[PDB]
């Protein structure tokens, strides 16, 4: 049973696609961000939020990805809950717009997302040409997608994912209120140095139907995320140099290379992605707050109760946003019971058989 | 000992600790240097960055301190002069200069000056890294011998960058490295030849003579083959690959290097050897042990062991010659006294007895 460890060594691909291979994909976007604080663009202050990718985490789950977000900093910003999703907003400005070239993206009184996103995806398809130094494409425009991909073709087919974000410093959505419960986990006190940090909205359309097309934006809170997977222990040295290890990042791990694998093969699964497991193991990790639960000894025992919970949240259909507790992530709208009976067969097969889909060699 | 070189690799991922973010800050600050340094009137208008691997520089010298990065500019046929009999250190004569070049007014006569090659480098760096807008980069006061031109990069503290100028020739290989990089019953005759094909470059680092002339002296650098050696290490194309196995070889570098920097960071008697003396003895290693299995990660308490003894071989026996140059003998009587010699043989061999005691860091 000793053979998950075997899976988590041949994981790593170091630099291939995480380390030469992903200061270079810095490389690019920084000449990107640069160029792209040129002229006079509604967006001459965007910025590279603080998170991590680059460095040695897009290589944790979901290796064929890379990710980025351009912060944006607006003002007063009034925020009307769309519907009861929790989630998705209607972005509005405070007061009567004075000082903003934002005002340019004004439909109605809200704060259009489409011909936001539709003006930055045009400034990002004309500044990566006006550099040759190496070969990067863009993506089409699909749907549902509120980012700007840069499918690049120097290692392999990487594809960095610019995602415009709206950055408020105001206090956070009341429906994130009794979310982020790390009380008994990483404390009250690092539960509230992270609340006053600003939360971001990226231009994701609410496709709840008739209504607004691109005007509904989403919260992201990737930077308070990364801020949990990295101080993720209750001690502070947990994982670091002087101090002790975890099988908790390695739970995470090998979760998502099993749901990764398990979708390569069935596209009944077309419905699960990697946030579902993200938001699972947050659950697993404050059920388990102590770091002697998640012991690097114990990496079968933590994986199977880690699996058993993943089972139980497709059974009950019940796997609520972690931030926020009244978005149900597997909501019948959302997933309907035949893919959560479809996926809890092949996770129960995968795991009453030895884990026949990690069979490399 | 009790398997504890497996507790020391993995604790020596301190790089994670404290020089991810500061790889970034080298590269994002570079990368801005080269890019402004791509102006006109310049004589490094056409000046690259030679690849030589990557800031995570815990594959060498896993040193967690200091860096370096190679900036490479082309120049047009040149004669490779060889100073006197180094085999290492040449006079850069040029033959024809093609009316265009930016070169022409760094010769001190028929040879090429890397005292003034160096001078404006450093004088066009300094004027560039301050027009660096929010970031807070100088440079440091030159420091003699010492052919960069260090950067001081304040952030968090202090982040030190060595900006060393390179002179690449896509020609032919001296004589003094025909015989050089013996890697033919290892990674092949197949993979050498290719190998050769690629430039070669010289570094501005003055010999040490009291007599002739070495204030423009050239220094033969493989630093671009030689990366490709470390992550080319195997005799089976599949070596530490993702469909193959896994093997020791850089796993006991970075043992050895660190062997060796806290022992050189404990007694400045070991001032006279660097981490060169340990990639080049671990080259002669793997080409005298080519098979894969002959370095296998179980057997990581004796294929390190096997690579102590051969290191205190060198020693004892005054003899490290130069991978790429047959001729240059880096453990010789003239550029390492023996009692330096004697006495890194007792420390290495203090430690081999001991279960290096040194290695104590928990
Ligand atoms: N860096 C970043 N921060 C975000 O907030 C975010 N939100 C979306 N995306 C990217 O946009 C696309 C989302 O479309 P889709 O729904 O079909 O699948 C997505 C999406 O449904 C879901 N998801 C990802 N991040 C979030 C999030 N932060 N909150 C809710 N759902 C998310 O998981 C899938 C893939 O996520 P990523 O791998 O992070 O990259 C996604 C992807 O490019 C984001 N990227
Ligand atoms: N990237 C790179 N390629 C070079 O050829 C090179 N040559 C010098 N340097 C750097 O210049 C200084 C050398 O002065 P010192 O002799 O006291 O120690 C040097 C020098 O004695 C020795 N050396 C000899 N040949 C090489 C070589 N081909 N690559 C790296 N180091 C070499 O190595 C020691 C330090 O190693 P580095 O850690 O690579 O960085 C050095 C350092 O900043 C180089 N840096
Ligand atoms: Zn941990
Ligand atoms: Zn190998």
């Not at 009861?84 to 340019?104: D, Q």
């Not at 130094?133 to 960095?160: C, F, M, Q």
């Not at 990496?299 to 972690?322: G, I, N, V």
Request: glycine content about 4%; overall charge positive; some cysteine.
């Amino acid at each position: 049973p000793d053979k998950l460890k075997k899976v988590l060594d041949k994981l790593r691909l170091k630099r291939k696609d995480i380390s030469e291979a992903a200061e270079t994909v810095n490389k690019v976007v920084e000449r990107l961000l640069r160029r792209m604080q040129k002229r006079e663009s509604e967006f001459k202050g965007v910025e590279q939020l603080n998170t991590g990718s680059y460095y040695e985490h897009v290589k944790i789950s979901a290796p064929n990805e890379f990710d980025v977000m351009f912060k944006l900093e607006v003002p007063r910003i009034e925020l009307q809950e769309y519907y009861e999703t929790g989630a998705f907003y209607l972005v509005k400005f405070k007061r009567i717009p004075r000082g903003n070239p934002l005002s340019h993206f004004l439909e109605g009184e809200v704060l259009s997302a489409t011909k936001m996103l539709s003006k930055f995806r045009k400034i990002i398809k004309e500044e990566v040409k006006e550099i040759k130094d190496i070969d990067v494409s863009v993506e089409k425009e699909k749907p549902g997608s509120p980012a700007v991909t840069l499918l690049i073709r120097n290692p392999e087919e990487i594809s960095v994912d610019i995602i415009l974000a709206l950055e408020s410093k105001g206090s956070w959505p009341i429906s994130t209120k009794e979310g982020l419960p790390i009380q008994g986990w990483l404390g009250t006190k690092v539960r509230t140095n992270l609340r006053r940090e600003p939360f971001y909205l990226v231009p994701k359309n609410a496709k709840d139907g008739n209504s607004f097309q691109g005007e509904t934006w989403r919260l992201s809170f990737s930077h308070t995320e990364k801020y949990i997977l990295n101080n993720h222990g209750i001690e502070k040295t947990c994982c670091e140099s002087s101090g002790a290890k975890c099988c908790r990042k390695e739970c995470l791990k090998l979760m998502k290379y099993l749901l990764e694998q398990l979708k390569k093969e069935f596209q009944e699964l077309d419905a699960f992605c990697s946030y579902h497991v993200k938001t699972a193991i947050f659950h697993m990790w404050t059920q388990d707050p102590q770091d002697s639960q998640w012991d690097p000894r114990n990496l079968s025992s933590c994986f199977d109760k880690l699996l058993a919970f993943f089972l139980e949240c497709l059974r009950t259909e019940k796997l609520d946003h972690y931030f926020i507790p009244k978005f149900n992530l597997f909501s019948q709208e959302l997933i309907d019971r035949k893919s959560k009976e479809f996926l809890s067969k092949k996770i129960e097969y995968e795991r009453n058989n030895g884990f026949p889909i990690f069979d490399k060699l």
